[PDB]
Amino acid sequence: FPELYFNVDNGYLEGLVRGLKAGVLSQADYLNLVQCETLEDLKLHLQSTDYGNFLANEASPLTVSVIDDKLKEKMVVEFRHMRNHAYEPLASFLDFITYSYMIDNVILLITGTLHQRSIAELVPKCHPLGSFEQMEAVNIAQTPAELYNAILVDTPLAAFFQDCISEQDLDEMNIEIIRNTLYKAYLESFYKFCTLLGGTTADAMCPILEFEADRRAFIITINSFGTELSKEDRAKLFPHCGRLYPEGLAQLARADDYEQVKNVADYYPEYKLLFEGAGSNPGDKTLEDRFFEHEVKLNKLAFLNQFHFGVFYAFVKLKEQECRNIVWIAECIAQRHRAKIDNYIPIF
Amino acid sequence: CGPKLAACGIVLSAWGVIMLIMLGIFFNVHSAVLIEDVPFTEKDFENGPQNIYNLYEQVSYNCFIAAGLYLLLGGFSFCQVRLN
Amino acid sequence: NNPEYSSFFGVMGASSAMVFSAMGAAYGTAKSGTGIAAMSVMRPELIMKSIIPVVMAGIIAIYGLVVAVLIANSLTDGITLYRSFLQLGAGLSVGLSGLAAGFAIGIVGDAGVRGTAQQPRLFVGMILILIFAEVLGLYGLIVALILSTK
């Protein structure tokens, strides 16, 4: 079915983004990167891979903060040059990728207004993959209630606010409860959208989004125990998509200590392995590190089917991991803490 | 009850008395525009109009009796509008 | 005397009883079996009880069989055309009622099993819900026994 028509609109971009997947640091590239001893050597290694010339015409006193900004500049330009060429089905799907970054921008805007800060102070700090198309909210910047109305007009996120949040809630909620209730609605809507693009998109994409929902339920649960969050607040923040939805979420809402979270994970052999693969001892990979490795295993495996949108989400989450990896290696090299340099996550 | 229902019963009383007396009169004069309204039967053609006239008289009485029920609704509602 | 096409409808009757009851019992068994699979992960003790909304899907295929056998054992070349339409009526009447009862048992099974995993008190409620599904196959059967023997 979908193979016949998919290359009519997306087949160029499917080829372009697979071209950009060949443009990643291999395990051998990371094993070359960690050998060297200064940020100038990172420049010489990245000069030899597909990142060539990215750091030419820049300040000779390099900093790890420049490496982070330049890797974001590479990632955003590669994404914009796809979104500008994508037609409506994919273009809506790519906008669902951008919506994750938009949530982390709009929460800064609201936080700024709740602390009387002008939005123009936060514009340079917003993720460029979550950048706004309409600027009337940015230009007005007057009050939290004015911004709420201006978000509903200007921002694609408007529906997620209307499902979960009034302006009065934004005066009373913690900003991290706000971010998570938006991400709940975002995942549930984006998972529904991916199942409306049924077949090879859902069959490669839903395994990732179901893992994002399951990972959130685990990590939100184990982190909530040291906090004022009630059983009901955990239940309200969990995404309903993942394998845990029938009962795992209920048992995690009942949980209050890490042993009960492992007892949920013990029912699913994947999650049993993630917990049993990390004690979080000194020099160990932490529980969240095992989840970041599995998120990458899923996003690699989404490239195994030539006719679907799974590659664009997977490409972005793997380029994000590649930016996380190159920055971490650059930190170990610049700070001389080479002991943990092997804690990057391999990709392909 | 409340004053709302009492006012409704007053309005229904006035209208009901007026219209049921007018119909009782139109039936008493054997009005032709009520030939479909009177509950006539296949036997009410025998010998002459006297059979259908007895039915016109019956429905005339029924309408005047029905106006009496709207007078009782009146007296009741003129109590209720003061009691509520 | 009686027409060339006369037995065709009575045969489509036996067919339609079995076919549409099998479609009903298949959809029942499919949805109920999915609900049992998804439930098993955290309530393995419930499986040998949660198979009821599958056993009942099997019973709808049996109501298709009992009509389709009864029609097939009562066909002949000479058949009166009237008897042939009655048998078609029996065939559709059980067959598509079994398709309806199978739709209900499939949905009620798939919801009822997961709901029972969340709440063990639902189980008697689920049997009561399922009896008012399974009986739709029975009403299809009752009519189809009547038409096939009229």
Added chain:
Amino acid sequence: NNPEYSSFFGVMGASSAMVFSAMGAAYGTAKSGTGIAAMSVMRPELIMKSIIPVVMAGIIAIYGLVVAVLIANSLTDGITLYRSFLQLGAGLSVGLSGLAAGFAIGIVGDAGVRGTAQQPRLFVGMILILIFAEVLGLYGLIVALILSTK
């Protein structure tokens, strides 16, 4: 004398009385059971009171049966084509009005039971709303009883 095919429309009446009424009672039991199951996790006590949507979907199946049997017991080879058309009308009338009542009882059942979990006052309300749906099956039955007996 009467056409050899005349009983076909009479049998399609007997069939439609049961087929579309089991489809009505099936959707009415599938949506009702779904709502009961999904509700039971939060309010396990309400499962017994919340059966009534299912029980009224069952009444739509029985409104099919009453007509399907009344038609079936009326058939004969010598049936006049007019009598068959009354029976066809009776069949589609109860059958598809039963289907319509089933759609209503299904949606009312599901929304009603989910609401009743959150607000116990809704119970008396949704019973009245179900009665205003089940009466569609009755009106289907009234017309089909009339047509089968003229």
Added chain:
Amino acid sequence: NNPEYSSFFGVMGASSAMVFSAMGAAYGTAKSGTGIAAMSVMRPELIMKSIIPVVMAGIIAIYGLVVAVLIANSLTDGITLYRSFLQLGAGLSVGLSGLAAGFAIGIVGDAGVRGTAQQPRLFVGMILILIFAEVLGLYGLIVALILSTK
């Protein structure tokens, strides 16, 4: 005596016994074969336990084949229309009942296999659900053997 086109129904019986059961067994093997393949990564030991729903999907095309060869060997150059209709009804009966069993084996043999890798205790129950799915092929066969030999 008999129409020369008379074999058309018996021929489309032999074909339909096969085609629809091969569609049933193909769907049954596609779904359960996807189940086995996606499952096997986490549980490489379960392949030879979980092939069983693929074996049962394979048996669905044996039900079609048994009837199709029985019909094909029962054709002749001017068959009585009655036997030709029986052969059509027999062929649809097993073909589409096998298609139905194939749907049920496909959904169950997929869902039960991903369930089994999460919880091996499901395997005992899964076989019973697959028996309630596969036996629809057999009820197909029973009605088709009665009809094709009546």
Added chain:
Amino acid sequence: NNPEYSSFFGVMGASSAMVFSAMGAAYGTAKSGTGIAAMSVMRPELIMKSIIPVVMAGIIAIYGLVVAVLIANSLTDGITLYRSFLQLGAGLSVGLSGLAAGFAIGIVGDAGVRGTAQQPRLFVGMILILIFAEVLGLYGLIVALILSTK
């Protein structure tokens, strides 16, 4: 003599033995050959081993070719109407069973190689699941050879 149009059905038999087998083998080869190509970048050694689902789909095109050749060599303007129908029966019986097998081979070849890339122990399971699919082409061929020679 036979009627003038007699050979039309048998020509459709050739032109559906091949067309629906070509559809089957095409989908089986396209789904499987996408699977192989995307898989191979992660495991460049596995192309040689992973051709088997494609060879199994190519066999469905051989089955359609065989029946179609057998029909096309048996056709004549003189063909009795009986044999012309047997040739359409044979042509659909293989052609659409080849389509069923090609659908299954496509799904289980893709899911088979995608799983096998991660977990080489699947490869033995995959070939068994494939044989349980490609044999559907064989069951359609058995009946089609029988029908075309009755």
Added chain:
Amino acid sequence: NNPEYSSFFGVMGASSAMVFSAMGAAYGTAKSGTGIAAMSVMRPELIMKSIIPVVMAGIIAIYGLVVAVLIANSLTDGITLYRSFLQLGAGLSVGLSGLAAGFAIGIVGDAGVRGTAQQPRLFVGMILILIFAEVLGLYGLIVALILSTK
């Protein structure tokens, strides 16, 4: 002598050759024009090279024109059904050939333009792949010229 309908099929030939080549050239020009527009913003100098997939779409409606004009000159009142259906065969042949070639010129054009803008090496690679599409219009022409002159 001739059937009064005879000249219809040749007229639908002449219509099809022009209409389906315009539908093809239109989609080809629409996809390619969208490509040139979206490309030009970054690489304005590349437009006069990038017109190639547009003019190669426009050429398809010249092959449709050549056949439709050839048919329109070939028509007469006294045309036999043979000469009329030959002209319908010509009309569908170039018509759907241009409608297919125009879709590959469109989609390859719309990629090949952006691909040349972001990677100048692909320009000849596009032109080769468009020659392999635009020759499909010539195949539908060559047979259509053969059928109109036969």
Added chain:
Amino acid sequence: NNPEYSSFFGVMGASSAMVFSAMGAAYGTAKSGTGIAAMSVMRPELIMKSIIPVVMAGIIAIYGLVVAVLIANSLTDGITLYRSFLQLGAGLSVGLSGLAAGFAIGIVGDAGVRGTAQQPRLFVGMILILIFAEVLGLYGLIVALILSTK
């Protein structure tokens, strides 16, 4: 003697010329107009040039009108079928060619006018792309004139 009912095809010719040219010119004008308006918020001085796509979509409606009038000026009571079919062909030939050309001018005009406000150097190219879209309506006309004058 010409058959009764003959004038119908010729009438549907004159209608099809105008209707499908309006449908094309309307879609062409709708997309070009949307592009002009969505463009002209940011570069309003481009309007006077940017209207040219709409003018070319309006010219397709003139090609429809010219043919529809030339056909209607050649209708008569008792038209011979040969000329009535030639008029149907002429009608569709310009009509659906203009429809196709309308999609091309529309998609080109939308993408190209919006592209032009980002990049003024596109305009001298977009005109050429539109000449390759507009000429389809002219080829539709050339055939339609020929058919309608034999």
Added chain:
Amino acid sequence: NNPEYSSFFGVMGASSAMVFSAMGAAYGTAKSGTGIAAMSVMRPELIMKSIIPVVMAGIIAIYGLVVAVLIANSLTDGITLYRSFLQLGAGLSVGLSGLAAGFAIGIVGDAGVRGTAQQPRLFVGMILILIFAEVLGLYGLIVALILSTK
């Protein structure tokens, strides 16, 4: 002399002149109307200028009425099929060209209003675009006036 049933096509001309034009004017008014409503919030001054799209959609209904009257005032029992086909052709020519014009008016009217809200200079461009949408109704009308008087 002239047949019964001959007026049917002339009536369907009067109907289609109206219905399709009312559908064109309804689209044109609906789509441009929602545009005006949404614009007016930001730009209350523009309301009385922004009605022109609605007014031009109103003219498409007028062109449908003009022809529908000119057809309906020209029906009689004895209508020669020639005059009746001319009336069907007229009623489709204006009815569907009015539809095409109306579809364009709706799309260009909305885009033109939303553009004018942000940038008042568009308004002259919006009228010029809109003339080329409304004139398709006039060309439909011309062909319908011509045909209905042949």
Added chain:
Amino acid sequence: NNPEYSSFFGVMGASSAMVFSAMGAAYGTAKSGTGIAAMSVMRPELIMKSIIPVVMAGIIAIYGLVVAVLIANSLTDGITLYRSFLQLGAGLSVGLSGLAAGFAIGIVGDAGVRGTAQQPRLFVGMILILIFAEVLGLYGLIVALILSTK
């Protein structure tokens, strides 16, 4: 003289005059009632201004009633087949034009009411748009009265 199977078209006229106008008024009422209900939350004072689209829908059903009654009074046993088609064309011409107007008012009533609550100046604009929507019902009545009395 006149055939039976002939008062049918005039009856479909009276029916369609009531049916498609009731559909027109139902869409008009359903969309306008949605807009008014959602609006009344923010502007509770506005309802008795913003109810006008609902009333402009109620009149479309009455335009159906006018024609429907006019036709049903003009029906007679043995009605000339000419008069019967004029009553069909009338019935559709009001019925489907009232449907067109029902959309045109339903859409601009929902949007116009919402916009009016966000900006009270729009009310004069909305009622002016509703004249140009409701007149499409009128144009169906005009032609329908002409066809009914011709």
Added chain:
Amino acid sequence: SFHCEYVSSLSKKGSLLVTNVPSLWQMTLHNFQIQAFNVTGEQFSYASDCAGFFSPGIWMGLLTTLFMLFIFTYGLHMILSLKTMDRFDD
């Protein structure tokens, strides 16, 4: 029985009476009805009219048109699936 509106040699009247060579004669039966087998008293049995729903010319007209309408629907399926970008590069 067989019934038709015309058995005639005239081209206007269905021309069922073919002549393979020129002839001086013409005939016409209007509302012709015949039955020469299995008669049952004075009445005809039921009649198989000449007036079938599809003539040969109609079958060929439909199986041309309703084949190339599959093509035209595919033409329009792709053309109606044309799209344009909502955004452009920097």
Added chain:
Amino acid sequence: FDFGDTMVHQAIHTIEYCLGCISNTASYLRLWALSLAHAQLSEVLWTMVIHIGLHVRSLAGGLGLFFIFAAFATLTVA
């Protein structure tokens, strides 16, 4: 003063003053339309309410008339 804007305004006004007034002759048919609806709504409300209250016995007729006319009044008002 502009001749161009004056010509456009006066053209639209003249169309309404001419062809619009022709159409407005038909627009007054709203009078008839609403009158027929009102009359027949009233007719059916009589035909399947008030008519049912008439009966061959005094008590049953008087009681029937009272309730039937109260239902009629309620529906007639609404």
Added chain:
Amino acid sequence: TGLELLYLGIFVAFWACMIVVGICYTIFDLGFRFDVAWFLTETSPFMWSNLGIGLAISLSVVGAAWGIYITGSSIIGGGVKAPRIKTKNLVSIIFCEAVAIYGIIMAIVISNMAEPFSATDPKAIGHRNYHAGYSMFGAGLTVGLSNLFCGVCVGIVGSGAALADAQNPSLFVKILIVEIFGSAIGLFGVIVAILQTSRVKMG
């Protein structure tokens, strides 16, 4: 969704009507009508044959066109970051052109077998002219639809190879094995269409 609801509505309405007709002609004993013998004799042999030629070229060319856009859209897209692709992956195009060419071969072969026959009575047409009309239609559908399916298949696996050959240059020469199996389907369409056509004559 939109157009698919229209195709579904046309399809379901048509088969619902064909159930009601096939019931009604059966039950009313009108099966002397629906005479597929009239249908398959009155519909002229010339029409069947020319649809056969026209679909032989056209459906093959549709198969080559979806072949070329399915592989061509990916060759170009992957070529952005790997220009070498345009050498090797042109073989997936050459196979698609070969599917069109199997169309033109057989459409010309069928064409050069079809002749006028100067008759219109089914007995004067005779079994030969019908067997040619049908066989040239079936041959035409057999090559036409086999090439349609072959060409979409080689397109899909050609896109397969082209996206694999972006990421690893060693894969293309090995993935071609599935393009040989895809190409067999077009040639099997040819072989059957040849054998169907081989016995025909008209005149």
Added chain:
Amino acid sequence: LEYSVVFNLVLWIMTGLALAVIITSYNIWNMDPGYDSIIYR
């Protein structure tokens, strides 16, 4: 005679005009009204 012609003329015209109305009516009924400045409220 010509009943086949009248049947097919009337059936295909009434099918065509029924589809042209249903398609047009569908494209107006399920039309996006696009009031995006206010639709959220």
